[PDB]
């Protein structure tokens, strides 16, 4: 059935623990096969868990990504939910982190159904070695 | 014209400031004249202005209500944003915070054009004596 809140809780987490130490495979597993991708949200959408496994691969290939909560995921009764964290990278050469905020929507099954990231270069943040 | 990723995050950061001094009047001033508001997420949207002042109007009256930024505002290219909130106020005769998240799409005349507000009783905490 349709997650509920706490379900939504525990599933978006979960998500942040998988996208750390980059489990692509499960990643994968967690989205609708004919899930939608948004990321960052307003660029053009990607569909399907093929190209959804592609667009993971080449942002948690390679460059060192780490990703953690920075607060609580706020979740709905109708099976969606938004989290804060912190996205660890190097951007143009350098270490930084880059605070974005993930919408998702899940099907009946529990499935990621829809996936928004909201972040640009304002929450971009260049880290003084 | 959309407003700009940096303009964003400062139109959402003052609709908190609204929120929090109560000021229905300059709140519903930021709405475009047929504007959706869901809050929570989940349920029915409210319709227009007079629908949403309405909303304002018996949400932030009467009871004690404050609000303010939890965390950076995340903002896209398209003149959208999230950003993570908490709200304060006396829930079931007893004061409580609740953790929030707000998506916002603004259009062309830098007016809000859709509000979602992301939280349930999972985001509420009872303040104990
Ligand atoms: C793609 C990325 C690494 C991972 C990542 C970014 C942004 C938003 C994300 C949202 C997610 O839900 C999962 C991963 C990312 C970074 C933006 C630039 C970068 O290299
Ligand atoms: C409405 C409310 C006070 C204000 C408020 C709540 C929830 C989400 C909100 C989102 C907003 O963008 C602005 C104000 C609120 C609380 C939930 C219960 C309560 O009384």
Redesign the interface.
Known sequence: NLPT??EV?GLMARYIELVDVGDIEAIVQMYADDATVEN???QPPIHGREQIAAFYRQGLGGGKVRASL???V?????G?????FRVEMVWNGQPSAL???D?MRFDEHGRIQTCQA??????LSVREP
Chains 1, 2 share one sequence.
């Open positions: 809140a706490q809780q960052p949200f307003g920075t607060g609580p706020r979740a709905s009764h109708n969606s939910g938004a989290m804060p605070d974005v905020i919408v909201y972040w640009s270069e304002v929450n």
